[PDB]
Design a protein around this ligand. Structure first.
Ligand SMILES: Nc1nc(=O)c2ncn([C@@H]3O[C@H](COC(=O)NCCc4c[nH]c5ccccc45)[C@@H](O)[C@H]3O)c2[nH]1
Ligand SMILES: [Cl-]
Ligand SMILES: [Cl-]
Lengths: 115, 110
């Protein structure tokens, strides 16, 4: 099954519902089910990559596409005061779904340090 | 910006890696045992103004970032962060990727 069987691969294949912001041939943007900000969504590749630590050199454009889509969706969602983009890697980074995903959070003042 | 001075080697920074299109160096106010930045040499002021033909460059920052993290021993994981604007807490208007690890990172991420 293309994209794998994590919750994210199932969302890609429309097997589990999600609230979809934007979709193209390379990625999917949808809202997070447990938001940590007034606006909190995810941008994920449709290609399954388990984590950024195993991304290949040829995934450069796909990862860059994740951030460009992230900043376009943020603008379309009216996050004009700013937002924060987060990729987590592994146990210390806080990763709980092993499919590469970009968090985009906004609608409030984000604090420092970022966790 | 001060990051421009760092790229031009006009002020010192503890450089981790450099190529023809980006620079990685330790952050001067670290928030984790390992905290570095990956910045492009092109002056993109902020992610919100990045163009579509910057997708390869922005992705290059992340691949460099994950390669430096491995080289710096972050085998238990790390967090990558890009801030935009006042709500995102962006501190310097030259786009930069934060990489933090060496300790458990918490949720929410700020
Ligand atoms: N729309 C949607 N549908 C789902 O079924 C679903 N299942 C999980 N998720 C979202 O994926 C995201 C998973 O991304 C992460 O791994 N982020 C870190 C959260 C986290 C889990 N454990 C941690 C430990 C330390 C620090 C952070 C964490 C979460 O925000 C979660 O709400 C979902 N989102
Ligand atoms: Cl600059
Ligand atoms: Cl910043």
């Amino acid at each position: 099954r293309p994209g794998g069987d994590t919750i994210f691969g199932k969302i890609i294949r429309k097997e589990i519902p999600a609230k979809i912001i934007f979709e193209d041939d390379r990625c999917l943007a949808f809202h997070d089910i447990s938001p940590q900000a007034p606006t909190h969504f995810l941008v994920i590749p449709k290609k399954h990559i388990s984590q950024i630590s195993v991304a290949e050199d040829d995934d450069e454009s796909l990862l860059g596409h994740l951030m460009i889509v992230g900043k376009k969706c943020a603008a379309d969602l009216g996050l004009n005061k700013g937002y924060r983009m987060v990729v987590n890697e592994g146990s210390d980074g806080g990763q709980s779904v092993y499919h590469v995903h970009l968090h985009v959070l906004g609608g409030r003042q984000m604090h420092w340090p970022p966790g």
